Symmetry: D2
């Protein structure tokens, strides 16, 4: 599990459940190719997006669909989504956790990178 | 204005208005002595807390009454208040802005220290 | 000034100065069209991006060049940039401030929308 | 495990290891009584602070010793510590995770409360 995404809700004080997440990888023709996608679990975690074989060096974009999350809770939020863009595996394979903390008009994100 | 406090609301996407803020200075007998206080303005700012002459080096605590702010909005909060504890150090001319971003179950704070 | 961007540095406790910021507007053919850009000031603010006449309703993307900012400080960063994507909605007179707080492996952003 | 504390480092992109944490509980004579303490593990988590029997209703303060954490890494930070103050178990037992994300001049905290 080299890429995991964890999403928390700062209004409710809970994991953000059923949040859609799309991962893209930058291609040779300077375009965002689809790479993996999933939804967060009851623990607000999304596991199994990729494998050590598939997750090669590259520039990745993790798009967290915060707007649909807030709209499903009957709230009109500010952002369309939260995007996290980074170079991965540049000095060999690493394990990445991308965490996001959400509020209707704000979000924070951090990365935990382990070898 | 050597010390200013700015408070933002992450739920409404606005300044946090009429928030009570209490500042204390640590005294030699390990006790917190009231130093300054006020309510944030319509811009979520609290100016005029102290003067350069009164704001000496030492340990200060800024306590933001977040619970009353959320209750006045009819929103259920987690924290009793938000406390920011720091040391004021004289090292050339310095202005301290303590900023806080509030959500019901979370808060963030940063210091903007400038000449 | 209907759109302002403010960027803070969580490592140095200061405004993030001379940060490049690019704003784009979403066009009918699902593409991002350049809209406005600039570099943050000594106060970490970028004023004068647009005018009330040019800033129509629509989806906007604010891309903050965080990687170049950290490299100029000799600090190793994680993100390629920070992107803030939102919808501008006309509902009475509104000013949008997009604020971001930067750290090498994390960032937070909030919207301050006022009359 | 009704009370857990998780601490992340936003500069390194890692768990914040060996962070001291002290928990206090407000007493009848309006004083902060010591309740539990520990240090975060290699995963930046602190488990086993208390038991469901001991963790009764009350106002608790979780003090995270961020200053000693940054000083042990050879960095001079802004805050003395990060304090999280909240009422616990007011409507019966709950499980609380207090998470904190640290930078030298800033911190964020959130709570995950589950039944
Ligand atoms: O000094 C001012 O005028 C000023 C303005 C905007 C500001 N936005 C913040 C802020 C933003 C985020 Cl995303 C997280 C945190 Cl902790 C703080 O602090 C500000 C200070
Ligand atoms: O409980 C866990 O396992 C777990 C994991 C990753 C986590 N990242 C956060 C986090 C992120 C931001 Cl951007 C701000 C703050 Cl305050 C916290 O909390 C986590 C908790």
């Amino acid at each position: 599990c080299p890429l995991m995404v964890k999403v928390l809700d700062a209004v409710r004080g809970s994991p953000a459940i059923n949040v859609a997440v799309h991962v893209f990888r930058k291609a040779a023709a300077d375009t965002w190719e689809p790479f993996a996608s999933g939804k967060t679990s009851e623990s607000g975690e999304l596991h199994g997006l990729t494998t050590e074989e598939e997750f090669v060096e590259g520039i990745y974009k993790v798009e967290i669909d915060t707007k649909s999350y807030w709209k499903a809770l009957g709230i009109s939020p500010f952002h369309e989504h939260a995007e996290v863009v980074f170079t991965a595996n540049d000095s060999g394979p690493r394990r990445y956790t991308i965490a996001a903390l959400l509020s209707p008009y704000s979000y924070s994100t951090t990365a935990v990178v382990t070898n």
